[PDB]
Design a protein around this ligand. Structure first.
Ligand SMILES: Nc1nc2c(ncn2[C@@H]2O[C@H](COP(=O)(O)OP(=O)(O)CP(=O)(O)O)[C@@H](O)[C@H]2O)c(=O)[nH]1
Ligand SMILES: Nc1nc2c(ncn2[C@@H]2O[C@H](COP(=O)(O)OP(=O)(O)CP(=O)(O)O)[C@@H](O)[C@H]2O)c(=O)[nH]1
Ligand SMILES: [Ca+2]
Ligand SMILES: [Mg+2]
Ligand SMILES: [Mg+2]
Lengths: 337, 341
């Protein structure tokens, strides 16, 4: 995946939490928000690098998906588990995707209905960090199929339920073939995050822009400024989905497209850059937990050190406390790519 | 232009209005609504077939434009068409490029040059023997996040502005939605349903068919399988920004639209495109005319009976008017019995 960089950081952070006896902190949830069809599920699964989320035309995501990535230590290499099926273990990622669709139909029906009941999915991997990603239905305007008159408000409040959590990062997704000032994602992000401390803007579908136009002004922050960044991506077309085009090919073609059409900005756009940018934000959040961790170490070390003049297990736990203080310093000094 | 069919009917109406001394039947105003950039100004000017509206990327329409088409008689004729703005008093505009520029100029004066929006309309009349008497209203597009000079409540200011025009019961709403967006996200159809819940005066226009993602098309949308729209769902293809930059003509735009529909939507091609949008509007306008003939007829009788009384049951004026009103009555029946090709 393009988000493996934090693995060694979280591994040593775990070591500290194990030593100090505390429960490890939770990274913020990464939540995708935007108008229906803006490319949300495509963006979110690109952080995983495995195809597991239903994507397509019209209304697709019809329940929240709480996708918990769970790091697997030494204790198929990758596998999935849904809460609703209890213990069934999925090694086939196409089957995982199909089960999301199955579960969605079971609760939301087979005629465009939307339910707030979340689907809980765990993906176990040695190549993922402990991180929760949240896929959501897109905002809409006119009820279709089974949807009630107030479907727009039902969806919007569903989204707010997730992004009003102060420990969430918002991926505000807007299609490039729409005017940025019409971004429903950015409007709603600014309601819960008025100062842009936890909103990252993603501009999808660069490849679908009208001839004679481009997203240069948008991507240079000259339309709507967004503090944490505005990152352009090119995910698979419906034709590509139908033809089962791989992630590898999608990424290669995305890179080529940016080099061809956005050469001056290409190194600050694309899916790999999105992943790196999210890593930096997650690291920022990690560094804010460290003072809390620090004070804990200092109290327990003074507690073990008063126990002096049994004698080995307190002596080497004092050694393990010392190691934890240095690990904290290392985390603070760690550079990511 | 594609909306000349009603000319003979409105000439007949004018003969009656001239006799009756008032323009008793007013056609509904045609008002374009939709999200910013949905292609509204492009659709509206296509009903004129002359390139007078500013069109482009980003925010373009920033004041209402009340565009009054005024049919001109042969006696008032004379290279055959011109424009006048209320704000430039009696200045006559002969060049339609200059008319487009003046809309931009007058927008900049009141709305500024950093994306601001004003509700104050620009009033423009276009005089021509090739147009009917018809008011078209261009409006700013709906938005979400303030930019430039725009205030924090820009979205509501624009939505409320649109509502003021489309809440007029004597208006046909062109609800414009870009084809490269999901129909269920149509701000145009949402707002239209607030003033026209029953769909009696809302026509859905689906623009930018040419921009749809590979592996997708608007067949379901155009067949009414997504959101049904009683009066119709009509797909169009107007000029791209590259086309605007390359000065592509209206003639070529329409030919390419026709070709596109033939290639991509062959089964539906004859019920889509710009000419079909015009023909659909013509039918709606003719239905309003037919609805109002009893009023017009009654009004003739009010005058006829009156001049007959002044005719002892001045005299010469009464006699001429009675004959003119007799003619007017005959014209009414002809209009009623006219069916469009
Ligand atoms: N050409 C192109 N198509 C894209 C891109 N990203 C997504 N798509 C296409 O857009 C459609 C929507 O993709 P998806 O990721 O399912 O969007 P979504 O916003 O999750 C849909 P919902 O709002 O219902 O959940 C699909 O047909 C997909 O192939 C892109 O960058 N370029
Ligand atoms: N490819 C393509 N481009 C179109 C079509 N219709 C309009 N455009 C393009 O979309 C952009 C917006 O067109 P315009 O007619 O100004 O839309 P508008 O909705 O009036 C813009 P505003 O909301 O600010 O008034 C222009 O760049 C124009 O070339 C279409 O059918 N196909
Ligand atoms: Ca006659
Ligand atoms: Mg989705
Ligand atoms: Mg416009």
């Amino acid at each position: 995946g393009p988000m493996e960089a934090l693995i060694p950081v979280i591994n040593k952070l775990q070591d500290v939490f194990n030593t100090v006896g505390a429960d490890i902190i939770q990274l913020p949830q990464i939540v995708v928000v935007g108008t229906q069809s803006s490319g949300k599920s495509s963006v979110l699964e690109s952080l995983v690098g495995r195809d597991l989320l239903p994507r397509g035309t019209g209304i697709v995501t019809r329940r929240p998906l709480i996708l918990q990535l769970v790091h697997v230590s030494q204790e198929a290499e990758e596998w999935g588990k849904f809460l609703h099926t209890k213990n069934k273990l999925y090694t086939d990622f196409d089957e995982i995707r199909q089960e999301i669709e199955n579960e969605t139909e079971r609760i939301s029906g087979n005629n465009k209905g939307v339910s707030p009941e979340p689907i809980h999915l765990k993906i176990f991997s040695p190549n993922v960090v402990n991180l929760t990603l949240v896929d959501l239905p897109g905002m809409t305007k006119v009820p279709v199929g089974d949807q009630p008159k107030d479907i727009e408000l039902q969806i919007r409040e569903l989204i707010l339920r997730f992004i009003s959590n102060p420990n969430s990062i918002i991926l505000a997704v807007t299609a490039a073939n729409t005017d940025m000032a019409t971004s429903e994602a950015l409007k709603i992000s600014r309601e819960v995050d008025p100062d842009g401390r936890r909103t990252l803007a993603v501009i999808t579908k660069l490849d679908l822009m009208d001839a004679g136009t481009d997203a240069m002004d948008v991507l240079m922050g000259r339309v709507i400024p967004v503090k944490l960044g505005i990152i352009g991506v090119v995910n698979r077309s419906q034709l590509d989905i139908n033809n089962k085009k791989s992630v590898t090919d999608s990424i290669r073609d995305e890179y080529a497209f940016l080099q061809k059409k956005y050469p001056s900005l290409a190194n600050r756009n694309g899916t790999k850059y999105l992943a790196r940018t999210l890593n930096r934000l997650l690291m920022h959040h990690i560094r804010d937990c460290l003072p809390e961790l620090k004070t804990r170490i200092n109290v327990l070390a003074a507690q073990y050190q008063s126990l002096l003049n049994r004698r080995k297990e307190a002596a080497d736990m004092l050694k393990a406390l010392q190691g934890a203080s240095q690990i904290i310093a290392e985390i603070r000094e760690t550079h990511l790519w």
